[PDB]
PDB file of C-alpha atoms and ligand atoms in Angstrom:
ATOM      1  CA  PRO A   1      -0.441-138.274-188.321  1.00 59.55           C
ATOM      2  CA  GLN A   2      -0.598-134.904-186.586  1.00 60.60           C
ATOM      3  CA  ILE A   3       1.887-134.953-183.695  1.00 57.47           C
ATOM      4  CA  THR A   4       1.614-132.511-180.776  1.00 54.96           C
ATOM      5  CA  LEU A   5       4.717-131.313-178.920  1.00 50.10           C
ATOM      6  CA  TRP A   6       3.766-131.733-175.260  1.00 49.93           C
ATOM      7  CA  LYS A   7       6.043-134.783-175.293  1.00 50.93           C
ATOM      8  CA  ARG A   8       9.106-135.546-177.409  1.00 51.84           C
ATOM      9  CA  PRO A   9       8.123-136.478-180.941  1.00 54.19           C
ATOM     10  CA  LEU A  10       9.545-140.008-181.067  1.00 51.73           C
ATOM     11  CA  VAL A  11       8.870-142.477-183.924  1.00 53.41           C
ATOM     12  CA  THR A  12       9.950-146.011-184.757  1.00 53.92           C
ATOM     13  CA  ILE A  13      12.345-146.378-187.692  1.00 55.06           C
ATOM     14  CA  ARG A  14      14.059-149.342-189.324  1.00 54.95           C
ATOM     15  CA  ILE A  15      17.595-148.991-190.562  1.00 53.06           C
ATOM     16  CA  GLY A  16      20.243-151.541-191.456  1.00 56.96           C
ATOM     17  CA  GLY A  17      17.693-154.206-190.480  1.00 56.27           C
ATOM     18  CA  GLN A  18      17.317-152.839-186.948  1.00 56.97           C
ATOM     19  CA  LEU A  19      14.324-151.168-185.307  1.00 62.93           C
ATOM     20  CA  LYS A  20      15.078-147.923-183.419  1.00 64.37           C
ATOM     21  CA  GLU A  21      13.293-145.030-181.758  1.00 65.82           C
ATOM     22  CA  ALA A  22      14.161-141.637-183.119  1.00 67.78           C
ATOM     23  CA  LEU A  23      13.247-137.984-182.592  1.00 72.28           C
ATOM     24  CA  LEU A  24      11.589-135.981-185.358  1.00 73.43           C
ATOM     25  CA  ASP A  25      13.806-132.941-185.273  1.00 71.60           C
ATOM     26  CA  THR A  26      13.139-129.796-187.317  1.00 72.17           C
ATOM     27  CA  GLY A  27      16.285-128.281-185.751  1.00 72.86           C
ATOM     28  CA  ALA A  28      18.513-130.950-187.309  1.00 72.50           C
ATOM     29  CA  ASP A  29      19.804-130.415-190.905  1.00 72.24           C
ATOM     30  CA  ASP A  30      20.877-134.080-191.164  1.00 74.39           C
ATOM     31  CA  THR A  31      19.731-137.386-189.668  1.00 75.70           C
ATOM     32  CA  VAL A  32      22.118-138.599-186.973  1.00 74.62           C
ATOM     33  CA  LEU A  33      22.035-142.043-185.374  1.00 75.19           C
ATOM     34  CA  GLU A  34      23.714-143.512-182.331  1.00 72.01           C
ATOM     35  CA  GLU A  35      26.777-145.685-182.895  1.00 73.83           C
ATOM     36  CA  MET A  36      25.919-148.866-184.787  1.00 73.72           C
ATOM     37  CA  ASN A  37      27.736-151.144-187.262  1.00 75.31           C
ATOM     38  CA  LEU A  38      26.203-150.164-190.594  1.00 76.16           C
ATOM     39  CA  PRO A  39      27.692-151.707-193.707  1.00 77.13           C
ATOM     40  CA  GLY A  40      28.500-149.505-196.703  1.00 76.39           C
ATOM     41  CA  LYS A  41      30.773-146.729-197.930  1.00 74.52           C
ATOM     42  CA  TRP A  42      31.093-143.739-195.600  1.00 71.74           C
ATOM     43  CA  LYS A  43      33.094-140.542-195.188  1.00 69.81           C
ATOM     44  CA  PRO A  44      33.941-138.683-191.986  1.00 70.86           C
ATOM     45  CA  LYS A  45      32.235-135.444-191.064  1.00 71.52           C
ATOM     46  CA  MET A  46      32.002-133.131-188.064  1.00 68.02           C
ATOM     47  CA  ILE A  47      28.624-131.807-186.919  1.00 67.07           C
ATOM     48  CA  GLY A  48      28.069-129.037-184.360  1.00 65.44           C
ATOM     49  CA  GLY A  49      25.335-128.619-181.777  1.00 66.22           C
ATOM     50  CA  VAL A  50      24.757-127.457-178.232  1.00 65.37           C
ATOM     51  CA  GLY A  51      27.879-128.611-176.399  1.00 64.95           C
ATOM     52  CA  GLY A  52      30.114-128.524-179.487  1.00 65.85           C
ATOM     53  CA  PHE A  53      31.139-130.997-182.182  1.00 69.22           C
ATOM     54  CA  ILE A  54      30.950-134.716-182.806  1.00 67.61           C
ATOM     55  CA  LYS A  55      32.695-136.809-185.446  1.00 66.62           C
ATOM     56  CA  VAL A  56      30.250-138.856-187.490  1.00 66.94           C
ATOM     57  CA  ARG A  57      30.380-141.371-190.308  1.00 60.55           C
ATOM     58  CA  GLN A  58      28.404-140.095-193.286  1.00 59.01           C
ATOM     59  CA  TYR A  59      26.615-142.785-195.273  1.00 63.49           C
ATOM     60  CA  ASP A  60      24.856-141.694-198.459  1.00 63.60           C
ATOM     61  CA  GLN A  61      21.852-143.298-200.190  1.00 61.99           C
ATOM     62  CA  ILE A  62      20.822-145.475-197.246  1.00 67.82           C
ATOM     63  CA  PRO A  63      17.287-146.881-197.173  1.00 66.92           C
ATOM     64  CA  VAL A  64      15.376-146.045-194.004  1.00 64.93           C
ATOM     65  CA  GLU A  65      11.788-146.795-193.022  1.00 64.85           C
ATOM     66  CA  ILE A  66      10.014-144.164-190.904  1.00 60.53           C
ATOM     67  CA  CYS A  67       6.433-144.890-189.768  1.00 59.46           C
ATOM     68  CA  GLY A  68       5.804-146.861-192.943  1.00 59.30           C
ATOM     69  CA  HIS A  69       7.457-144.286-195.217  1.00 55.57           C
ATOM     70  CA  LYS A  70      10.237-145.882-197.235  1.00 55.00           C
ATOM     71  CA  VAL A  71      12.893-143.226-197.901  1.00 56.72           C
ATOM     72  CA  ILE A  72      16.515-143.157-199.079  1.00 55.94           C
ATOM     73  CA  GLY A  73      19.135-140.664-198.098  1.00 57.65           C
ATOM     74  CA  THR A  74      22.029-139.624-195.947  1.00 59.34           C
ATOM     75  CA  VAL A  75      22.488-140.957-192.427  1.00 59.41           C
ATOM     76  CA  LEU A  76      25.241-139.827-190.075  1.00 60.98           C
ATOM     77  CA  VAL A  77      26.406-142.336-187.483  1.00 60.12           C
ATOM     78  CA  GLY A  78      28.238-141.369-184.286  1.00 61.39           C
ATOM     79  CA  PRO A  79      28.077-140.447-180.637  1.00 62.55           C
ATOM     80  CA  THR A  80      24.793-138.534-180.533  1.00 61.85           C
ATOM     81  CA  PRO A  81      22.905-139.135-177.307  1.00 63.01           C
ATOM     82  CA  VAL A  82      19.616-139.642-179.140  1.00 59.67           C
ATOM     83  CA  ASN A  83      18.694-140.917-182.588  1.00 58.10           C
ATOM     84  CA  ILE A  84      17.615-137.919-184.646  1.00 55.95           C
ATOM     85  CA  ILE A  85      15.585-137.707-187.890  1.00 57.06           C
ATOM     86  CA  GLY A  86      16.640-134.463-189.533  1.00 54.94           C
ATOM     87  CA  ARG A  87      15.299-132.315-192.323  1.00 52.81           C
ATOM     88  CA  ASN A  88      16.961-134.325-195.102  1.00 51.36           C
ATOM     89  CA  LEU A  89      14.567-137.162-194.259  1.00 49.11           C
ATOM     90  CA  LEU A  90      11.681-135.138-192.811  1.00 46.86           C
ATOM     91  CA  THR A  91      11.272-133.604-196.286  1.00 46.40           C
ATOM     92  CA  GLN A  92      11.027-137.095-197.805  1.00 46.79           C
ATOM     93  CA  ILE A  93       8.159-138.136-195.521  1.00 48.34           C
ATOM     94  CA  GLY A  94       6.478-134.802-196.281  1.00 45.55           C
ATOM     95  CA  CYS A  95       6.633-133.494-192.751  1.00 45.62           C
ATOM     96  CA  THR A  96       5.562-129.913-192.054  1.00 48.65           C
ATOM     97  CA  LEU A  97       5.320-127.734-188.952  1.00 50.16           C
ATOM     98  CA  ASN A  98       1.866-126.220-188.505  1.00 50.68           C
ATOM     99  CA  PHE A  99       0.445-123.452-186.291  1.00 47.28           C
TER     100      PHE A  99
ATOM    101  CA  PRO B   1       0.947-121.121-191.350  1.00 47.56           C
ATOM    102  CA  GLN B   2       2.417-124.429-192.571  1.00 46.52           C
ATOM    103  CA  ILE B   3       6.206-124.472-192.760  1.00 48.91           C
ATOM    104  CA  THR B   4       8.004-126.937-195.058  1.00 47.53           C
ATOM    105  CA  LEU B   5      11.479-128.171-194.097  1.00 46.20           C
ATOM    106  CA  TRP B   6      13.522-127.742-197.267  1.00 45.18           C
ATOM    107  CA  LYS B   7      15.119-124.788-195.483  1.00 44.90           C
ATOM    108  CA  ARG B   8      15.825-124.271-191.805  1.00 45.05           C
ATOM    109  CA  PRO B   9      12.576-123.107-190.136  1.00 42.72           C
ATOM    110  CA  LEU B  10      13.865-119.724-189.045  1.00 43.94           C
ATOM    111  CA  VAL B  11      11.573-117.082-187.599  1.00 41.11           C
ATOM    112  CA  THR B  12      11.801-113.614-186.083  1.00 42.20           C
ATOM    113  CA  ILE B  13      11.176-113.415-182.367  1.00 37.60           C
ATOM    114  CA  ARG B  14      11.106-110.544-179.881  1.00 38.63           C
ATOM    115  CA  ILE B  15      12.514-111.030-176.394  1.00 41.13           C
ATOM    116  CA  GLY B  16      13.529-108.410-173.852  1.00 39.64           C
ATOM    117  CA  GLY B  17      12.578-105.735-176.392  1.00 40.36           C
ATOM    118  CA  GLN B  18      14.949-106.960-179.106  1.00 40.22           C
ATOM    119  CA  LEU B  19      14.351-108.673-182.415  1.00 39.66           C
ATOM    120  CA  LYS B  20      16.236-111.894-183.127  1.00 38.10           C
ATOM    121  CA  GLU B  21      16.225-114.753-185.588  1.00 35.31           C
ATOM    122  CA  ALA B  22      15.482-118.174-184.134  1.00 37.26           C
ATOM    123  CA  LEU B  23      15.124-121.820-185.147  1.00 36.37           C
ATOM    124  CA  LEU B  24      11.815-123.658-184.625  1.00 35.25           C
ATOM    125  CA  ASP B  25      13.232-126.817-183.041  1.00 34.10           C
ATOM    126  CA  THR B  26      11.056-129.848-182.345  1.00 33.76           C
ATOM    127  CA  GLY B  27      14.081-131.724-181.019  1.00 37.49           C
ATOM    128  CA  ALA B  28      14.660-129.187-178.244  1.00 33.11           C
ATOM    129  CA  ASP B  29      12.786-129.671-174.972  1.00 31.06           C
ATOM    130  CA  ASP B  30      13.695-126.150-173.992  1.00 28.35           C
ATOM    131  CA  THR B  31      14.199-122.754-175.586  1.00 28.06           C
ATOM    132  CA  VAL B  32      17.872-121.671-175.567  1.00 28.47           C
ATOM    133  CA  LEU B  33      19.072-118.251-176.722  1.00 28.96           C
ATOM    134  CA  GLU B  34      22.566-116.984-177.438  1.00 30.05           C
ATOM    135  CA  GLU B  35      24.220-114.856-174.760  1.00 29.31           C
ATOM    136  CA  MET B  36      22.258-111.686-174.151  1.00 32.04           C
ATOM    137  CA  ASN B  37      21.263-109.496-171.272  1.00 29.38           C
ATOM    138  CA  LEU B  38      17.788-110.109-169.970  1.00 27.44           C
ATOM    139  CA  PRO B  39      16.086-108.594-166.954  1.00 27.83           C
ATOM    140  CA  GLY B  40      14.660-110.853-164.255  1.00 24.11           C
ATOM    141  CA  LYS B  41      15.711-113.423-161.701  1.00 24.22           C
ATOM    142  CA  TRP B  42      17.556-116.435-163.066  1.00 25.89           C
ATOM    143  CA  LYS B  43      19.334-119.549-161.827  1.00 22.96           C
ATOM    144  CA  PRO B  44      22.149-121.636-163.355  1.00 18.44           C
ATOM    145  CA  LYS B  45      21.291-124.840-165.227  1.00 19.22           C
ATOM    146  CA  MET B  46      23.142-127.364-167.354  1.00 18.89           C
ATOM    147  CA  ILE B  47      21.554-128.445-170.633  1.00 19.84           C
ATOM    148  CA  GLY B  48      22.791-131.227-172.870  1.00 19.34           C
ATOM    149  CA  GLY B  49      22.890-131.705-176.615  1.00 22.36           C
ATOM    150  CA  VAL B  50      25.154-133.108-179.304  1.00 23.27           C
ATOM    151  CA  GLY B  51      28.708-132.471-178.155  1.00 24.33           C
ATOM    152  CA  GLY B  52      28.012-132.302-174.424  1.00 23.99           C
ATOM    153  CA  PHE B  53      26.387-129.957-171.925  1.00 25.40           C
ATOM    154  CA  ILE B  54      26.525-126.195-171.570  1.00 25.09           C
ATOM    155  CA  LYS B  55      25.840-124.027-168.570  1.00 27.84           C
ATOM    156  CA  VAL B  56      22.984-121.562-169.014  1.00 27.56           C
ATOM    157  CA  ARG B  57      20.917-118.984-167.160  1.00 29.74           C
ATOM    158  CA  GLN B  58      17.357-120.138-166.593  1.00 30.62           C
ATOM    159  CA  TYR B  59      14.805-117.333-166.607  1.00 29.42           C
ATOM    160  CA  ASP B  60      11.204-118.280-165.889  1.00 28.03           C
ATOM    161  CA  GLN B  61       8.047-116.489-167.025  1.00 28.51           C
ATOM    162  CA  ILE B  62       9.581-114.521-169.898  1.00 26.97           C
ATOM    163  CA  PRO B  63       7.253-113.158-172.580  1.00 25.28           C
ATOM    164  CA  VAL B  64       8.411-113.991-176.084  1.00 22.17           C
ATOM    165  CA  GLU B  65       6.876-112.746-179.303  1.00 20.02           C
ATOM    166  CA  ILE B  66       6.979-115.493-181.915  1.00 18.48           C
ATOM    167  CA  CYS B  67       5.645-114.943-185.433  1.00 18.99           C
ATOM    168  CA  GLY B  68       2.956-112.570-184.112  1.00 22.53           C
ATOM    169  CA  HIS B  69       2.093-114.803-181.150  1.00 23.38           C
ATOM    170  CA  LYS B  70       2.766-113.585-177.602  1.00 23.09           C
ATOM    171  CA  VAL B  71       3.786-116.501-175.358  1.00 23.37           C
ATOM    172  CA  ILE B  72       5.231-116.745-171.860  1.00 23.19           C
ATOM    173  CA  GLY B  73       7.585-119.417-170.564  1.00 24.76           C
ATOM    174  CA  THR B  74      11.096-120.511-169.614  1.00 26.15           C
ATOM    175  CA  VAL B  75      14.068-119.149-171.534  1.00 28.17           C
ATOM    176  CA  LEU B  76      17.602-120.424-171.109  1.00 33.71           C
ATOM    177  CA  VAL B  77      20.459-118.088-172.057  1.00 35.23           C
ATOM    178  CA  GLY B  78      23.976-119.188-172.838  1.00 35.79           C
ATOM    179  CA  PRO B  79      26.606-120.235-175.390  1.00 34.56           C
ATOM    180  CA  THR B  80      24.341-122.047-177.855  1.00 35.20           C
ATOM    181  CA  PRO B  81      25.538-121.663-181.443  1.00 34.39           C
ATOM    182  CA  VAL B  82      22.005-120.787-182.561  1.00 34.50           C
ATOM    183  CA  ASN B  83      18.814-119.353-181.070  1.00 33.92           C
ATOM    184  CA  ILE B  84      16.471-122.311-180.621  1.00 33.53           C
ATOM    185  CA  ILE B  85      12.738-122.239-179.875  1.00 31.95           C
ATOM    186  CA  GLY B  86      11.998-125.554-178.170  1.00 27.76           C
ATOM    187  CA  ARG B  87       8.798-127.437-177.380  1.00 30.06           C
ATOM    188  CA  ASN B  88       8.129-125.542-174.140  1.00 28.94           C
ATOM    189  CA  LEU B  89       7.199-122.541-176.325  1.00 31.62           C
ATOM    190  CA  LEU B  90       6.203-124.307-179.588  1.00 31.79           C
ATOM    191  CA  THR B  91       3.316-125.831-177.607  1.00 32.95           C
ATOM    192  CA  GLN B  92       2.254-122.354-176.504  1.00 32.77           C
ATOM    193  CA  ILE B  93       1.774-121.316-180.130  1.00 34.89           C
ATOM    194  CA  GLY B  94      -0.228-124.466-181.010  1.00 35.63           C
ATOM    195  CA  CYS B  95       2.566-125.930-183.149  1.00 38.22           C
ATOM    196  CA  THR B  96       2.308-129.531-184.456  1.00 40.31           C
ATOM    197  CA  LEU B  97       4.236-131.802-186.803  1.00 40.29           C
ATOM    198  CA  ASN B  98       2.203-133.196-189.644  1.00 41.33           C
ATOM    199  CA  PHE B  99       2.929-135.901-192.227  1.00 39.57           C
TER     200      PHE B  99
HETATM  201  C1  017 C   1      21.216-127.238-181.886  1.00 38.76           C
HETATM  202  C2  017 C   1      20.532-127.480-183.222  1.00 38.76           C
HETATM  203  C3  017 C   1      20.847-126.293-184.128  1.00 38.76           C
HETATM  204  C4  017 C   1      20.955-128.799-183.898  1.00 38.76           C
HETATM  205  N1  017 C   1      20.772-129.960-183.004  1.00 38.76           N
HETATM  206  C5  017 C   1      19.415-130.528-183.118  1.00 38.76           C
HETATM  207  C6  017 C   1      18.623-130.213-181.855  1.00 38.76           C
HETATM  208  O1  017 C   1      17.237-130.401-182.137  1.00 38.76           O
HETATM  209  C7  017 C   1      19.069-131.034-180.652  1.00 38.76           C
HETATM  210  C8  017 C   1      18.644-132.499-180.751  1.00 38.76           C
HETATM  211  C9  017 C   1      19.073-133.282-179.539  1.00 38.76           C
HETATM  212  C10 017 C   1      18.122-133.808-178.661  1.00 38.76           C
HETATM  213  C11 017 C   1      18.522-134.495-177.521  1.00 38.76           C
HETATM  214  C12 017 C   1      19.882-134.693-177.272  1.00 38.76           C
HETATM  215  C13 017 C   1      20.828-134.178-178.150  1.00 38.76           C
HETATM  216  C14 017 C   1      20.426-133.475-179.290  1.00 38.76           C
HETATM  217  N2  017 C   1      18.480-130.474-179.459  1.00 38.76           N
HETATM  218  C15 017 C   1      19.093-129.782-178.499  1.00 38.76           C
HETATM  219  O2  017 C   1      20.250-129.385-178.458  1.00 38.76           O
HETATM  220  O3  017 C   1      18.167-129.410-177.443  1.00 38.76           O
HETATM  221  C16 017 C   1      18.703-128.958-176.197  1.00 38.76           C
HETATM  222  C17 017 C   1      17.800-127.807-175.743  1.00 38.76           C
HETATM  223  O4  017 C   1      16.693-128.460-175.108  1.00 38.76           O
HETATM  224  C18 017 C   1      17.074-129.764-174.632  1.00 38.76           C
HETATM  225  O5  017 C   1      16.239-130.844-175.092  1.00 38.76           O
HETATM  226  C19 017 C   1      17.001-131.824-175.799  1.00 38.76           C
HETATM  227  C20 017 C   1      18.470-131.489-175.572  1.00 38.76           C
HETATM  228  C21 017 C   1      18.484-130.017-175.129  1.00 38.76           C
HETATM  229  S1  017 C   1      21.930-131.114-183.056  1.00 38.76           S
HETATM  230  O6  017 C   1      21.467-132.308-182.391  1.00 38.76           O
HETATM  231  O7  017 C   1      23.130-130.658-182.434  1.00 38.76           O
HETATM  232  C22 017 C   1      22.203-131.530-184.590  1.00 38.76           C
HETATM  233  C23 017 C   1      23.095-130.832-185.401  1.00 38.76           C
HETATM  234  C24 017 C   1      23.307-131.192-186.722  1.00 38.76           C
HETATM  235  C25 017 C   1      22.636-132.300-187.227  1.00 38.76           C
HETATM  236  N3  017 C   1      22.830-132.692-188.504  1.00 38.76           N
HETATM  237  C26 017 C   1      21.793-133.044-186.416  1.00 38.76           C
HETATM  238  C27 017 C   1      21.565-132.657-185.100  1.00 38.76           C
END
């Protein structure tokens, strides 16, 4: 689709078997999801935004479905206030910004 | 133009007479710039991101030059780690996400 920005650009994703709403976020390097119990190997990481840093669990090579696009990559899990789809996955769905 | 997301979508803006680099940020409701002087009336606001909230100066009706496009809207100034162009101004340049 072509998504305008008058409202937040929210999409449905599926990850670890669960459906979620997430924000398509060109300002995010990495995808970051709210706290959930994902199985798999992970390593700790700190990410910085407005307000400072959060500790996240970094899971590599995770399958995610985003509006019908089946992708595989890194997902960070921790205390973000909103589920965010970052550039690492935006590039896999072929997302561009146009003006 | 159409901007891919392999790299951060960084652009040159002009605000208050000065050239700056900024991030085109679809996950930001609002435009937030690093501490700077700016003429005009302002009022204090809190804005919230990953890590918590920061206190900013809200200036309304500020002209911003973005990639050759002159727009006018709200600019928040404060201790953000990066200059971020949010939807309030992305909409003014006709920006969309496409995939
Ligand atoms: C500040 C950016 C350089 C990076 N941020 C992404 C950004 O799009 C967040 C994404 C975001 C969105 C909502 C809540 C938290 C974070 N937006 C944000 O801080 O916007 C603020 C300014 O306008 C307001 O509207 C939304 C919050 C305010 S970030 O969330 O901190 C972030 C940082 C690193 C990664 N990997 C993923 C996300």
